[PDB]
Amino acid sequence: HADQDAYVADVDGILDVLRAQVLERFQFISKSALSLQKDSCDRINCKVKDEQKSRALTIIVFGASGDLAKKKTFPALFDLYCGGLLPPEVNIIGYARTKVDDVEKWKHETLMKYFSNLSERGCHAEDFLKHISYFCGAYDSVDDFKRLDAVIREKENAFKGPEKGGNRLFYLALPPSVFASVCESIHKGAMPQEVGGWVRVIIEKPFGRDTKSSAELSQALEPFFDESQLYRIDHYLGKEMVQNIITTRFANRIFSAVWNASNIACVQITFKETIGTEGRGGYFDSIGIIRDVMQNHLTQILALLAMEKPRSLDAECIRDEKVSVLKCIEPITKENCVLGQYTASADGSIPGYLEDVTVPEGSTCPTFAVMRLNINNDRWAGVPFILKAGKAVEQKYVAIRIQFRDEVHPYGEATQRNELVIRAQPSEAMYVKITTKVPGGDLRQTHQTELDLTPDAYESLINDALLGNSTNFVRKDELDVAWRIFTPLLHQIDSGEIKPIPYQAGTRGPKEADEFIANNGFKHQ
Amino acid sequence: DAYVADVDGILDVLRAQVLERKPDDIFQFISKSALSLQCDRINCKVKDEQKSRALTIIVFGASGDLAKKKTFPALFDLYCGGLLPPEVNIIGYARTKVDDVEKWKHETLMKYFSNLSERGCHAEDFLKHISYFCGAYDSVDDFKRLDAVIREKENAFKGPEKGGNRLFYLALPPSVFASVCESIHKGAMPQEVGGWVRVIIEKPFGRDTKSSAELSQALEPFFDESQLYRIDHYLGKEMVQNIITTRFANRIFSAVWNASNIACVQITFKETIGTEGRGGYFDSIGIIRDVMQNHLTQILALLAMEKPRSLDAECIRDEKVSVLKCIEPITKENCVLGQYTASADGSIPGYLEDVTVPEGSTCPTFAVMRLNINNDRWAGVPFILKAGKAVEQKYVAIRIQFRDEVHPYGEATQRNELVIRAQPSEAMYVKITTKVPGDLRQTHQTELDLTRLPDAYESLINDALLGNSTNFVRKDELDVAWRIFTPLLHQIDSGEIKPIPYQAGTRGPKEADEFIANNGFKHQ
């Protein structure tokens, strides 16, 4: 309805007129309201901001000798350095349990092995290692964090610059079981100095495995770090796609006006991988495809896509809207879910999921899921939202597909449903499919045409955290709502009330899934 | 410098309110959300007789959770509001020796005082009125020693009259009530020269007809029903006036307050909190004894009574008794029980997860039941009491649903309602159908609103201090109240009904809502 969007715009335009009147200094808002009634391996070029330059900065990577830290975090930090997005005087500390004598060989052997050895980057590796130190320490001794504090205080007091104190980003590349321990230890032991500096904490998934376990972690952490400080990171959600979702829609009347039940026939969000899970049963078997990427990754995409209009692009305004729309979503039913589990590829190259020492025999863990979500609000009531995720399928692909309702009249078969695709993998692309004339010479001689409207994902998130921008991080309330959307389903699945269909590695998945989709409003182009 | 723009921040709150609620008139809603988005010498408001004589308040069990977290903070609030006499003496009476009474004051009491500015700045002054007294609850000599301590404060009283008034507050297990009352009777009654004696006692008042009557007979040699105040913490003055005045002062409400016009009456008490690890204690009590036989029944009496001969306390109490005597004993077939299980987010563990709860507990944390008031006014009208822990909102209200006018409006009208709500905020309103301007069949449901003071608990203590016993259950009233519930409780304890599990934070068991719909209620 034009009136749904008009009313919001009228409220915002009233709050806007109470803005430029209150620009002349609660009780004044009440009075004004009734009143309105009556009417090449080159040099790193530093792209960092002034404030970023102005105070010291230490990044502490905890669990620095783990696979995530050494293969993912440190390389990501390296790429940001090469991109000129770390402050000049950035200090990095790898905190970990094991004692190390030859500090410099550890950086070279545990860390540099994994750096991007590309042309434009390789030459900067040694430069980056200068900014790194090692810290031997455990994740609970108050002593160890007192010592670390003093190690940081020395580097911060050495900073050659205008502001005192130090900004501190604690990056917990650890198993969630130690999050609370470390967090309290930081709180008691190693917060930024009184004089100045912010404190930020990046934590890694899993964020529980259901409503109850997730809220226990939130409760454990919330004594020590609030939602301005805590950053729950989703490696796979990048700047590029988020901007495509938000900007393309909210900046433009044309897309804004059609982004609703009256115009949209159906929406799919798809996350497909050719890779399987081989030798990862130790993580995956207990998690399943749904907890792994759908409850966390796909649902945040969905929230950004479905949300109502925030009043501004301030992060918490957007996060507020993510929560509101998630709260409109009905808990997913077992009647709206098709599950799969992959067997060996027909060509015998790829082994099945159960064919794995790190997977328990008999496992019914799903590697594939397609489900329908109902968003019960004025904007979305009736519209099918399809989430689809799967391992060992036919191609690597992440995209949003919005199919618009057909204009049957008057072009009939000389036209076709409009679409909007926002694709992130294997490469970024955003387009609309529309119908246009061909130059020749009758009106029903039409064409299908694709208007193109167009640091990696993980890196862009670490950068956002340094910048203090939490837009693309799940907030504590948001996380809780998301868990309530999926947990009843996850229970039904673990109680065996629905079961995975087998599919061979390299196919599309269970044929049943494609029938589900087609039976839930999608029409083939 | 000061580019705070927290303006924008509050604009955001307004926005969220407007779009949540979606008013027709944005402007007028902006005002009402803004105004409702918003130190000094104490002004003595106390009356003539109250300033005339010494007052001493003795809180027995002063280091207990009830006394330090509820009673003493309430007295502080009364003090800050000018509702205690200026020379009031407060005595905390307990059994543990205390080296430093000043530290006790600061650590045991002042910790639970309201941190409100306009109160904080009075705490130290209030503490000057509090003494600690250490003694037993059964030794006459301790009460004589207490009497000496009181007489000393009374005799230094600088106002006109002699002796003093004594309010004894028994924040104790009822097992010690008789021994305290006897000890008071022998040892520290007010001075003969002048002063009254009042005694406030806490629930439970027994746990069935027999235990309760035995308790009343243990106390009546010492205190009569003008001296004895059985306190129900939850019964506020504001609710009671809503119940009494709206009806009895008005022809329109009096005329419809009967079987000819009312389809059903529901009295609801809902909390989001569980038993909070005190399940072991709750388990011997259960929801029916906890709030229904006492609290909801008093609300029912006030709501259902005949017109009092006057608005005097004992005339109201006489009518409370008369109506309760009309009520049939509740049958098990008119009762649905629940027991909560863990909340979705686990913040409320299941009732049975508490290790202090014994395996196999069928204690109800939830109950809905129907009472039949067999009199001319009420014959055939279902009265529903509903109470529940660990449900979906904190809420206390009376809902009166009137009979429908089938003709002529049919589906273009629905049943009128009178709501008197106390929690989470006071409201009272009627829902009637009215025309929309713009088609006789085009109608709207509208709510007519009929409209820091003391809170409900503070109101009752203030009432005891003033001698107003309206909102206190009288001995005879209590007996009758117990005769309504005791058969049912017996059936429950014999295992004849069993509680339906419900998840903490839901409404309760689906069978309870169906029971309500089966006994005369119709959803909007």
Ligand SMILES: N[C@@H]1[C@@H](O)[C@H](O)[C@@H](COP(=O)(O)O)O[C@@H]1O
């Ligand atoms: N917008 C991001 C993309 O940047 C990302 O690439 C993709 C997941 O794919 P991958 O797991 O390869 O990052 O979806 C996310 O939503």
